[PDB]
Amino acid sequence: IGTGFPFDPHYVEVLGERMHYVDVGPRDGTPVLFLHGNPTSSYLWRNIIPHVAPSHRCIAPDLIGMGKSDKPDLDYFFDDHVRYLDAFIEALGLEEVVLVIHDWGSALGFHWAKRNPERVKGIACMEFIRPIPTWDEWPEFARETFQAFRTADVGRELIIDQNAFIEGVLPKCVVRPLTEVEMDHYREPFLKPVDREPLWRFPNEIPIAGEPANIVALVEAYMNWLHQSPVPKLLFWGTPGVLIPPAEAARLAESLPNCKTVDIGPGLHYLQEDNPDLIGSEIARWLPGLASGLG
Numbered sequence: 001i002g003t004g005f006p007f008d009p010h011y012v013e014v015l016g017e018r019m020h021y022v023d024v025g026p027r028d029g030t031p032v033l034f035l036h037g038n039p040t041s042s043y044l045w046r047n048i049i050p051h052v053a054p055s056h057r058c059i060a061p062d063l064i065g066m067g068k069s070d071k072p073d074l075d076y077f078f079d080d081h082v083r084y085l086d087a088f089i090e091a092l093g094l095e096e097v098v099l100v101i102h103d104w105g106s107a108l109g110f111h112w113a114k115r116n117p118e119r120v121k122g123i124a125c126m127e128f129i130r131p132i133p134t135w136d137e138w139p140e141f142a143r144e145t146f147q148a149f150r151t152a153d154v155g156r157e158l159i160i161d162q163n164a165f166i167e168g169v170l171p172k173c174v175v176r177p178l179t180e181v182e183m184d185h186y187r188e189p190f191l192k193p194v195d196r197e198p199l200w201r202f203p204n205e206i207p208i209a210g211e212p213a214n215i216v217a218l219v220e221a222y223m224n225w226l227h228q229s230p231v232p233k234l235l236f237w238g239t240p241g242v243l244i245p246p247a248e249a250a251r252l253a254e255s256l257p258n259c260k261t262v263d264i265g266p267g268l269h270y271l272q273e274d275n276p277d278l279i280g281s282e283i284a285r286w287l288p289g290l291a292s293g294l295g
């Protein structure tokens with residue numbers, strides 16, 4: 001698995017801040033928009049993009065406050081990310097797009113799709129954000145850790161002071177061992193502890209057991225849309241997984257219209273680090289069928 005990031009940097013000014021993004025492949029045609037989550041960046045898609053670039057334009061932005069994008073003094077609530085991504089998409093003048101999303105990138109993607117259904121040609125997703133009814137449904141090996149992340153004071157000490165999301169969660173959620181260089185790529189954006197704010201707000205935004213109410217409502221809303229939408233969907237899942245265990249993927253294969261599922265083998269949360277080749281090749285084979293004749 002490649003550890004390099006052979007993509008030229010591209011920047012665009014959005015809401016008074018500069019956002020970094022990968023932009024490769026053809027200059028025209030339907031763009032494939034890759035959205036990462038916590039605590040990653042476009043680096044997460046480095047080994048998947050090469051499978052798609054030969055046939056489609058690939059755009060992979062670093063969310064505000066992450067990767068190589070600027071890091072303004074925000075509280076980084078989900079809403080801040082929504083505003084910046086909305087502006088990012090309009091800044092690049094994107095019309096219709098195909099979404100490839102993960103984790104908080106999936107919450108952003110699904111939310112954008114719900115609000116702009118006529119502009120979403122297809123959605124490839126994996127380990128995405130959905131309402132978690134109870135802590136019972138959160139994987140045991142990571143249960144107390146996320147409960148701690150959402151506990152006053154304790155959570156910030158772990159994530160901000162100790163950088164536990166980068167040093168602990170990330171590596172512990174890839175089946176194969178991440179190498180030193182890969183970890184250093186992920187560590188780079190957060191060498192200043194204060195910049196770890198988004199890494200802490202994210203876990204506190206996850207809809208678990210009905211909290212936080214505002215995010216729960218927003219997520220329930222896009223899931224309601226997703227279940228009723230005829231848009232082509234491609235869901236990658238692994239075993240045992242985290243947010244989308246095998247049993248959940250099997251349920252979604254039925255409850256999500258026009259849905260195709262792909263078993264990537266062993267995987268926890270950052271599936272892209274365990275089987276990027278299958279994810280990339282399957283997306284590439286899936287894209288052509290999203291078209292409806294010449295146009």
